[PDB]
From a paper:
Sugar attachment to hydrophobic carrier molecules for transport across membranes is catalysed by polyisoprenyl-glycosyltransferases (PI-GTs), integral membrane enzymes conserved across all kingdoms of life3. The structure shows that GtrBSyn is a tetramer, with each protomer consisting of an N-terminal cytosolic GT domain of the GT-A fold, a juxtamembrane region, two TM helices (TM1 and TM2), which form a compact stalk anchoring the intracellular domains to the membrane, and a short C-terminal beta-hairpin. The soluble glycosyltransferase (GT) domains are separated from the TM helices by a juxtamembrane region that positions the active site 15 Å below the membrane surface.
Subsequently, although probing the function of the enzyme with structure-based mutagenesis, we produced crystals of the point mutant F215A, which fortuitously diffracted isotropically to 3.0 Å, allowing us to improve the quality of the model. F215A, which resides in a functionally relevant region of the protein, has compromised catalytic activity, but the structures are essentially identical, and unless indicated otherwise, we show here the better F215A model. The structure of GtrB from Synechocystis sp. determined here at 3.0 Å resolution, is the first for a representative PI-GT, enzymes that attach a sugar to a lipid carrier for use in glycosylation reactions. The UDP-glucose donor substrate binds in a shallow cleft on the surface of the cytosolic GT domain, in a similar position to that determined in other structures of GT-A fold GTs19. First, ∼900 Å2 of predominantly hydrophobic surface is buried between each pair of GT domains in the cytosol, with eight inter-subunit hydrogen bonds and two salt bridges formed at each interface, suggesting a stable structure that is unlikely to disassemble for the GT domain to move to the membrane.
Numbering used by the authors:
A (entry chain B): -3 to 124, 133 to 197, 205 to 251, 258 to 316
B (entry chain D): -3 to 123, 129 to 195, 207 to 252, 259 to 314
C (entry chain A): -3 to 127, 146 to 197, 208 to 257, 259 to 313
D (entry chain C): -4 to 196, 207 to 255, 258 to 314
Write the structure that this text describes.
């Protein structure tokens, strides 16, 4: 039989203290990936595990040519450990999976089908009010991806999308709004069996309007400027009408003293985002690699 | 029968939902470019259209070696879609053209002729007291050619030399080249003959903030000297006229007001710093037809 | 017998006016490094010395193949000259020491042993007395340490490598350990505050939320609680005016403190001027 | 004879409306450079001239293999036009001179001599003993604490714009945007081997550049004022927390004498905080801006950058 040096699919699994599930995960994944008759690879990212998960990963690495390990220097975030695996993931399609396996792995057979039709990004949302009517008109046409009962963390992305978001710091939080900005051909498939809180979803909306727009800063600059010209001109005219004494002296100082703190709020928020954009510090660090080559030190 | 590999002219056309005008656009442009006896290319930028404009593009691409398609991932806007096409245009001269042919394509013959005389940028300009005031404020900085400003003139129909495209290639302001960047790059400029001042002076403020630090510096010193006049007014005059409310409110209103536009000029420049340091690209290319991906 | 191309250990010594200690430093260093039977190199960084330190360095350079000199243009400081020496230092392990030998060179034999076991970073912290790791208050871990090649490469482009003991050692992770050896509380939390602002961004966000929610309590109380109760035509006026201008006028200064603090760090991150400048090199090549 | 391929000296001249002085400039410079018996080059930067200076430069370029022209797209500052010429200048030493010839060119023989002695930067400051006053002694005593023994290169009646710089110095500051104001403080930060040569042939801007220096090479104005503004904030918050927690009473203490002063003091310290914050924010924009420092329209006898 012949050989093929091109990888078509890459599954990335971040692991933190997953000593138990390695045998069942690899057996289930093999029973799902083998019938496809397509070359693949398994990127296992050890995220500073303490329960000897790495020792078991290396054992599966020795007896499986598809197992590749990315050992981080310490425990990072789950999203950061996922970004590290995607960086070391070669292949035309990338799909992340969880270790606890809340979603059936057999569903990848349906995701790759939509990818073969031409779709660059294919989500896997489960099937299960005024907010949904809102985001459909502004945020994204496919609001069912980020509905309360399911997050679009189970998805397939083409190589063009992974390459497009390689340098973006928002690739860590790709489901926070970056998916609606990158565009491309998107679709989803349906299936059945913390998060899910509406406070945590409007938190993603607030985190989205500040990250992909300058409106909160610009509309407050113009608003603060027009109330400033009203303040200075009315003070010059008041110093040459009605002088309500305390009914204005307290109102004015406590109004201006309060509006400056929220102005300093949006300034401090955007200043923190500008800092996070200019840091030379990477998202993660790789301690060891098994079955992979290091990324170029240019970065 | 000499095969020339160098592209002499580049026509860049951003298109969003121009399914109807494709037949007349490519045909009427051909009768203008053929008598020039000059190698050229047409860079057609698909800006996320839904009305199957891309399918009609690919059909024209299949039977025309000068048609090259740049398929964007989504709708990004006219200025960004134009910037994407200029990036993939490797010709000695670049000319952006609208698909609805608001300007006659025959002016290309006039644009290239003035370009061969040595001019690096050649424009194509059409022909109350606000018209006398606005035109007078701009000749002090714009220079010899200001007619590209005065309404309804827009310089979006122009010819730019390769040196000019390369000079503004990495600048984020290349999307709004007609917002002030044309007057900063300088070069040898000229034009050929053939609104809303609320938006015209909007670009004046957007230019003073983009190419200068004067509003921030001037207000920094202006707010600093009134801070010294402040602290000194309560430094020596506390060891001991007191209009009471006539100044307690005014000072509260005055000192609180000069800070609000101090945070305004700071908040404006801070947003510009974000737009300069953000890692998010200007656009994303979904597919390419007849072109290679960048960087080459 | 046979030549060896790869250097295994690198000793980095920042030097400022060390004309006298050179004879004893190089002799005692050779006494410690020779029994290791391991190829090494000594990177000597001249940090703008005013005495005859450089002349003695060149003399030792001429008769010793392991002495290499990095001459800085001017005096940049102990930390910057240390970063400059690590940049021009190749080898699997890097160990910085001082010219005045409060750091006994014999501990290198123990530092390399812990590194042989798999530890990527091995500290040489002094014993405390008085009254993992976390020895950063009593005498505390200093610039006496061993770092694997993977660790020095990971923080090569980071500006925080100058102050690696200010918090970067806790962020990089890796396998870490320390070794104890013998022979102010204000700087403790001065460096602790210097760490919570560089690797966290929480002091800015927490004060952003706090300053904004007290702005809502402020604005809501004066906009239409006072206007709604005096539209019919109060709390002690002077006491309320005084407590309002000083509470609001002072909390804004803390917001300006954290904003100015982070703005200065953004300037230090985007400035194009380098950290140091090399005037001459002896036994080394220029970078990049 | 034989041919040498390395350039030993580079003379950079920014030119703006120098049509008349070109004939006297190139001839007098050639009479100074020939006896040195070392290879050299003359980089002429056309800085958006409005007359026929460029046409005359091209004529000198056609008959002189040492004349090279850098034509900028438009008129920039003299600092920018000089930085553009240094970028296209290849050579072991670089010397910038003015076109109107305000300083004698014969000093090059002394600059190269000091350069061959080992000095990386050699200045040529004028010798003026006039204007000795107490203010000059104050400025000299305050600037000597940071600049060093070489600080004499900036008395009020002279600057250090006539200098020789080694290739290592021009390379060290090639990517720095502050190279246009190299004589505004950057010369003292590079710290290379420096000396000057003497020859005899406003205080507003001096301390203005010093104020620009403490902001350009330091963070003290921002750090000191944030610390100061914070400790007076602690005094303001605490003292007001006890003025509201003093329930042992119920109209005013000092009424207008203190309260009007209070809004004034807290309102003024914030304006200085906004002053230093806005000042450093503008410098951050100048460091992160993608807009280049200059643009080159044409080149004669040179290659475009990068190589
Ligand atoms: O610090 C962490 C935490 C999480 N994980 C990985 O992320 C998944 C988190 O699973 P969990 O059920 O807690 O999150 P959820 O299923 O709700 O998305 C696990 O498979 C871990 O392998 C990780 O690598 N590092
Ligand atoms: O979102 C858009 C809108 C405009 N266009 C193109 O930009 C040009 C603008 O022409 P239009 O007549 O629509 O605008 P106007 O003439 O008013 O300037 C047209 O060729 C469009 O194809 C585009 O690429 N994306
Ligand atoms: O400005 C300086 C001061 C320190 N050093 C070097 O750093 C080490 C620290 O020595 P020092 O005794 O001054 O530091 P301390 O003992 O107080 O920790 C010495 O080898 C010096 O040569 C230096 O290169 N430049
Ligand atoms: O806008 C300018 C002004 C100055 N110069 C050049 O800089 C030098 C300084 O000229 P000027 O005599 O006007 O300045 P000053 O002699 O007073 O220092 C001259 O050789 C000019 O060619 C320039 O290139 N562009
Ligand atoms: Mg789980
Ligand atoms: Mg139109
Ligand atoms: Mg010491
Ligand atoms: Mg002059």
């Amino acid at each position: 039989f012949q050989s093929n040096a091109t990888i078509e699919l890459s599954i990335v699994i971040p692991m933190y203290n997953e000593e138990d599930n390695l045998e069942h995960l690899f057996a289930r994944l093999l029973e799902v990936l083998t019938p496809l008759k397509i070359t693949y690879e398994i990127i296992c990212v050890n995220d500073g595990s303490k329960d000897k998960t790495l020792k078991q990963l290396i054992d599966c690495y020795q007896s499986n040519r598809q197992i590749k390990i990315v050992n981080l220097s310490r425990n990072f975030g789950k999203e950061i450990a996922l970004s590290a695996g995607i960086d070391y993931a070669q292949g035309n399609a990338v799909i992340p999976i969880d270790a606890d396996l809340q979603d059936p792995p057999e569903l990848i057979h349906e995701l790759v089908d939509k990818w073969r039709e031409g779709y660059d990004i294919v989500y896997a949302t489960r099937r299960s009010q005024f907010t949904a009517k809102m985001f459909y008109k502004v945020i994204g046409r496919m609001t069912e991806i980020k509905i309360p009962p399911n997050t679009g963390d189970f998805r397939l992305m083409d190589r063009k999308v992974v390459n497009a978001i390689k340098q973006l710091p928002e690739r860590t939080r790709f489901m926070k709004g970056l998916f609606a900005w990158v565009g491309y051909r998107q679709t989803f498939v349906l299936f059945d069996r913390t998060k899910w809180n509406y406070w945590k979803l409007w938190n993603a909306a607030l985190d989205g309007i500040f990250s992909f727009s300058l409106l909160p800063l610009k509309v407050w600059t113009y608003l603060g400027s027009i109330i400033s010209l009203l303040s200075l001109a009315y003070a010059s005219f008041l110093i040459l009408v009605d002088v309500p004494g305390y009914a204005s002296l307290m109102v004015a100082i406590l109004f201006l003293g309060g509006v400056q703190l929220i102005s300093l709020g949006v300034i401090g928020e955007y200043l923190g985002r500008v800092y996070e954009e200019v840091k030379a510090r990477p998202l993660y660090l790789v301690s060891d690699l098994w079955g992979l080559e290091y990324l170029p030190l240019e970065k």
